[PDB]
Amino acid sequence: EIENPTIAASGIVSVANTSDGRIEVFGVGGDNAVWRNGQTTHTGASWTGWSSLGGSVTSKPAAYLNSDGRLEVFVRGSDNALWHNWQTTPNASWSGWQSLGGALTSNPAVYINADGRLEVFARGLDNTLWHIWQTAPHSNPWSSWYSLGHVITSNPAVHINADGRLEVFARGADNALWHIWQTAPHSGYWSGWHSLGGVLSSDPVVARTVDGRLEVFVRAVDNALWHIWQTAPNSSQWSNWASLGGTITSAPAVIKYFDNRLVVFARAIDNALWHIWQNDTHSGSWSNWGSLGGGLSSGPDVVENANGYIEVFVRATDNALWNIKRTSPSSWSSWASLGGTLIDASAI
Amino acid sequence: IAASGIVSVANTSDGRIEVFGVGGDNAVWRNGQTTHTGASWTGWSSLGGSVTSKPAAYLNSDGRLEVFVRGSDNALWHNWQTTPNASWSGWQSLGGALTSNPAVYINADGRLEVFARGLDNTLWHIWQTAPHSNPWSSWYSLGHVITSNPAVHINADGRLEVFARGADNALWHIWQTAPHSGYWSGWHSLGGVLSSDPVVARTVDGRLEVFVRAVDNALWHIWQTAPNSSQWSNWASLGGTITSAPAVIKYFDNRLVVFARAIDNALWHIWQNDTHSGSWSNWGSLGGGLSSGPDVVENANGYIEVFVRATDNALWNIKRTSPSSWSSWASLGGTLIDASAI
Numbered sequence: 001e002i003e004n005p006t007i008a009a010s011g012i013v014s015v016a017n018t019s020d021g022r023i024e025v026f027g028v029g030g031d032n033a034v035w036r037n038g039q040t041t042h043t044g045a046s047w048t049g050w051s052s053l054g055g056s057v058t059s060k061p062a063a064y065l066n067s068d069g070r071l072e073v074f075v076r077g078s079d080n081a082l083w084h085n086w087q088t089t090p091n092a093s094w095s096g097w098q099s100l101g102g103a104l105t106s107n108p109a110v111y112i113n114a115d116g117r118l119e120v121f122a123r124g125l126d127n128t129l130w131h132i133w134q135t136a137p138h139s140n141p142w143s144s145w146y147s148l149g150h151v152i153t154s155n156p157a158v159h160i161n162a163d164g165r166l167e168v169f170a171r172g173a174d175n176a177l178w179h180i181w182q183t184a185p186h187s188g189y190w191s192g193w194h195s196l197g198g199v200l201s202s203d204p205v206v207a208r209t210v211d212g213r214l215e216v217f218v219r220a221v222d223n224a225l226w227h228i229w230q231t232a233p234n235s236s237q238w239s240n241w242a243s244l245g246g247t248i249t250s251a252p253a254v255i256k257y258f259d260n261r262l263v264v265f266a267r268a269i270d271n272a273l274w275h276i277w278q279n280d281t282h283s284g285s286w287s288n289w290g291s292l293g294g295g296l297s298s299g300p301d302v303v304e305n306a307n308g309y310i311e312v313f314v315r316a317t318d319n320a321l322w323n324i325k326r327t328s329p330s331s332w333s334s335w336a337s338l339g340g341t342l343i344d345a346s347a348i
Numbered sequence: 349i350a351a352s353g354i355v356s357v358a359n360t361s362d363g364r365i366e367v368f369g370v371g372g373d374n375a376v377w378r379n380g381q382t383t384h385t386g387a388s389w390t391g392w393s394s395l396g397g398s399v400t401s402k403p404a405a406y407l408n409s410d411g412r413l414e415v416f417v418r419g420s421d422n423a424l425w426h427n428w429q430t431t432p433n434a435s436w437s438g439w440q441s442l443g444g445a446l447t448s449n450p451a452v453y454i455n456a457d458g459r460l461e462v463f464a465r466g467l468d469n470t471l472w473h474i475w476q477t478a479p480h481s482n483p484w485s486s487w488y489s490l491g492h493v494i495t496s497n498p499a500v501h502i503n504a505d506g507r508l509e510v511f512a513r514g515a516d517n518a519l520w521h522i523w524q525t526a527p528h529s530g531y532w533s534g535w536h537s538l539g540g541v542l543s544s545d546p547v548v549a550r551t552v553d554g555r556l557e558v559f560v561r562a563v564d565n566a567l568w569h570i571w572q573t574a575p576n577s578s579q580w581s582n583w584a585s586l587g588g589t590i591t592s593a594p595a596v597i598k599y600f601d602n603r604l605v606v607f608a609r610a611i612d613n614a615l616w617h618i619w620q621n622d623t624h625s626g627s628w629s630n631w632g633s634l635g636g637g638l639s640s641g642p643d644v645v646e647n648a649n650g651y652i653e654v655f656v657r658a659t660d661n662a663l664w665n666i667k668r669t670s671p672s673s674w675s676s677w678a679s680l681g682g683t684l685i686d687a688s689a690i
C-alpha cells in the first residue's frame with residue numbers, strides 16, 4: 001500500500017457566521033459532546049460562554065448556514081454514522097441529534113448547491129468519496145448514501161464553481177491532489193476523477209477567488225505551504241503547483257480579506273500563528289510570512305466578522321479556545337481566551 | 349417620483365461589473381469591465397429589443413446574468429447568458445401586462461422571482477419553476493393598489509419581502525409566510541409620505557432597512573428592530589434636499605452608505621458612523637453634474653462603484669480605489685435615455 005504522510009494538525013472548531021451577523025463556534029468537549037460558543041451580538045463586544053449540544057462524536061464537527069438562515073452541525077457519531085443537529089428556527093432552539101446513517105472514515109464536509117440543498121461529503125468504509133444531500137432546499141429528509149468512487153487518504157474539501165457546479169478535493173492513495181465536479185449544477189451526474197499531482201501532507205483547503213477561480217492550499221511533504229488554481233473560472237486548465245515556503249505544522253486556513261485578497265493562516269514549527277497574503281488578486285504576488293505569536297495546540301480556523309474583519313480561532317497549550325482578530329484596516333487585536341476545554345476529535 | 353438611476357448594475361460570476369441601459373433607439377445596451385480589476389471597459393454593445401421600462405439585471409445561482417425589461421407590448425421580456433459571461437439568448441416574452449419597472453430577487457431555493465405593477469395597479473409576480481432555469485410560472489396578483497416601482501429583498505430567514513408606495517403615498521410591504529412557502533402575508537402599512545421608489549438594504553445583523561425621498565424632499569429611513577422582526581422603527585430623517593431616488597450599499601466594514609443627486613445636481617452621499625448606534629455622518633459632495641439618480645455596486649476590489657448619467661447623457665463612473673481614496677470621474681460614454689415605466 002502506497003504510504004501516506006501524516007496529515008497536518010486540524011483546527012479545533014467549526015467557525016460559522018449566523019444569519020444575524022454573529023460568529024458561532026462548534027468544538028468537541030472532554031465528554032466527547034459538541035459544545036458551542038458565540039458572540040452575544042454582531043459587534044462582538046462579548047461571547048455567550050460554552051453550552052453543550054450533547055451527543056458523543058468521533059470527528060471534527062462541520063457547521064453550515066442553510067439558505068433559510070438556520071445553522072446546522074454535521075459530525076461522525078459513536079457508530080461511525082453521519083449525525084446532524086439543526087436550529088429549528090434561525091438562532092433559536094436546536095433539534096437534537098438525528099442519524100443520517102452511513103459508515104464514514106473521515107470528517108464530514110458540507111456545501112450548499114445552487115438550489116439551496118446542503119450536500120455532505122465524507123470518505124466511506126471502502127475509502128471512496130461518499131456523499132448525501134437534502135432532498136429539498138434547507139429541509140429534511142435526506143437521500144441515502146452514494147459513492148463517487150476513487151481511493152482517498154485525506155478528509156474531503158468542497159467548494160462551488162463560478163457556474164454553480166460543486167467540486168470536491170481529496171488526497172489520493174498516490175498522495176496527489178484529486179478532484180471531481182458536478183457536470184452541471186446539481187445535474188444528477190459527476191465528471192469522474194482528475195489528478196492535479198503533488199505530494200500532499202495535509203487535507204486540501206479550497207477558496208474561490210473574487211474572479212471565480214478555485215484555488216487549493218496544502219502542506220506538501222517538504223512541509224512548505226503549496227497552492228494551485230484554475231487559470232480561469234470553470235477552467236479545463238489548472239496552473240502548475242507553486243510553493244509559498246514556510247515550515248507549517250497545521251492545515252492552512254484561507255479567507256478573502258475585505259478587499260478580496262487571499263490570506264492564509266497556519267501554525268508553524270515554532271507553534272506560533274503565522275500568516276501570508278496576496279499583494280494583489282491577479283499578478284500572483286504574495287507577501288513574506290508574518291508571525292502573530294501565540295502558542296497553538298491546533299491549526300487556526302478563520303471567518304470574516306460583522307465589522308468586515310478577519311477573526312482567528314486556535315486551541316492554546318491550556319486546551320482553551322483563543323481568539324485574535326483585525327480591529328481596523330491597519331491593526332490586529334490582543335490574544336484573548338474564550339476558555340473551555342477542547343479535544344481534537346479529527347477522524348483521520 | 350424622484351428621478352431614477354439610468355442603469356441596472358450587476359456583478360458577473362467572474363467578478364466584473366456589467367451595466368444595462370436604454371439607448372436613444374429604445375434598445376438595451378450593455379457595457380462591462382474588461383477584467384475584475386475594472387481598469388478598462390469593453391465599450392457599448394447592443395442587446396437589441398424595443399423597451400418601455402428601466403432594465404433589471406440579476407445573477408442566477410448558476411452564474412449566468414439575466415436582464416428583465418417591459419417590452420413595446422407592456423409584457424415582461426428577458427434575455428440571458430446561455431453560458432456564464434458568453435453569448436446572449438436574445439429577447440423571450442414572459443407575457444403579462446405591466447405598469448412599472450420589473451424588480452428581481454433570488455429565492456432561498458435558487459429560483460428568480462420578478463415583481464412589477466400589473467394592468468389593475470396591483471402587485472404582480474412570476475418565478476422560474478426550477479432553479480436558474482426556464483420555463484416560468486404564469487402571472488399572479490398579490491393585490492393592493494401601488495403607485496411606485498416595487499422593491500424586493502430577502503429576510504435573514506430566507507422569506508422574500510416586497511415594498512411599494514400605496515395610493516396614500518405610504519410605504520406598504522408584504523412577505524412570503526416562509527421561504528418560497530406558496531403563501532404570502534397580508535399587506536401592512538409602515539406609513540410615511542414617499543416622493544420616490546423605496547430602496548431596501550439588509551444590515552450585516554440581518555435587518556431590512558428602507559430608504560426613500562419624502563414629501564419634504566429629505567432622505568428618510570425605517571428598519572426592522574431585529575432580524576425577521578414583527579416590529580419596525582419609527583421613520584427618521586437624514587435631511588438634505590435630494591432630486592433622485594437614493595442608492596444604498598454596505599461599505600467593506602458593513603456601514604450603510606446612501607448616494608443621491610442633490611438640488612445642485614451633484615452626487616452627494618451620507619453614511620452610518622457604526623452598525624450598532626443609529627449615528628449617521630453629515631452629507632458630503634462628490635460633485636458632478638447629474639441628469640439621473642445613482643446606481644451602486646461593490647466591485648471585485650471590495651470597493652463601492654457609482655454610475656450616473658451626466659448633462660452630456662453619457663454614463664459616468666466614480667469608485668473607491670482603496671480604503672482611503674476615490675477614483676477620478678471617468679466617462680464610459682454612450683447616450684442613455686430614462687425609460688423608467690413610472
Ligand SMILES: CO[C@@H]1O[C@@H](C)[C@@H](O)[C@@H](O)[C@@H]1O
Nearest residue numbers: 029030031035050340341342
Ligand atoms: C466550559 O466547559 C468546559 O469546556 C467544554 C468544551 C467541555 O470540555 C467541558 O467538559 C468543560 O468543563
Ligand SMILES: CO[C@@H]1O[C@@H](C)[C@@H](O)[C@@H](O)[C@@H]1O
Nearest residue numbers: 055056057077078079083097
Ligand atoms: C445523542 O446520541 C449520541 O450522539 C450521536 C452524535 C451519536 O454518536 C449516537 O450514537 C450517540 O448515542
Ligand SMILES: CO[C@@H]1O[C@@H](C)[C@@H](O)[C@@H](O)[C@@H]1O
Nearest residue numbers: 113119133186187188189190
Ligand atoms: C439531488 O442531488 C443532485 O443529484 C444527486 C444524484 C447528486 O448528483 C448530487 O450531487 C446533486 O446535487
Ligand SMILES: CO[C@@H]1O[C@@H](C)[C@@H](O)[C@@H](O)[C@@H]1O
Nearest residue numbers: 161167181234235236237238
Ligand atoms: C467542468 O469542470 C471544469 O473543468 C474541468 C476539466 C476541471 O478543470 C474543473 O476544475 C473545472 O471546474
Ligand SMILES: CO[C@@H]1O[C@@H](C)[C@@H](O)[C@@H](O)[C@@H]1O
Nearest residue numbers: 371372373377392682683684
Ligand atoms: C455607443 O452608442 C451610443 O449609446 C448607445 C447606448 C445608444 O444610445 C446608441 O444609439 C448611441 O449611438
Ligand SMILES: CO[C@@H]1O[C@@H](C)[C@@H](O)[C@@H](O)[C@@H]1O
Nearest residue numbers: 397398399419420421425439
Ligand atoms: C426583440 O423584440 C422586440 O423587443 C422586445 C423587448 C419587445 O418589445 C418586442 O415586442 C420587440 O419586437
Ligand SMILES: CO[C@@H]1O[C@@H](C)[C@@H](O)[C@@H](O)[C@@H]1O
Nearest residue numbers: 455461475528529530531532
Ligand atoms: C414556487 O414559488 C413559490 O410559490 C409561489 C406560489 C409563490 O408564493 C412564490 O412567491 C414562491 O416563491
Ligand SMILES: CO[C@@H]1O[C@@H](C)[C@@H](O)[C@@H](O)[C@@H]1O
Nearest residue numbers: 503509523576577578579580
Ligand atoms: C414574518 O415577517 C416579519 O414580521 C412581519 C410582521 C413584518 O415585520 C416583516 O417585515 C417581517 O419580515
